[PDB]
Nucleic acid binder design. Structure first.
Length: 37
RNA sequence: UGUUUAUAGCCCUUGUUGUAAUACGUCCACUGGGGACUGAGGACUGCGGCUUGCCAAGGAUGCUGACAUAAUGGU
């Protein structure tokens, strides 16, 4: 998460405020075709 | 009024169709719908299924619209 991995003159992202921004858990819902009347 | 299938029939017993059907009881790791409430958790770990990726498998996501309002909510 340091700068050697992602070095730039502007950084990969300009600013890193606040908490870690918790990623949602990987859902297990898959879209399937609707069975119509 | 009286008799025993006749110009109606019924009952009892036995065979065949029959290994009949239906009801009831029971089970299916068989199946088709309709309605309601709930979405806690938050990278990855697991147990499974499928065929390495996928999956309804250790708790909801997806696609849209209206309003962006005093609408919802509070007093």
């Amino acid at each position: 998460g340091e700068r050697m991995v992602l070095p730039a003159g502007e950084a990969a992202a300009k600013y890193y405020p606040a908490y870690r921004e918790n990623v949602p858990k990987k859902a297990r819902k898959a879209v399937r075709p609707t069975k119509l009347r």
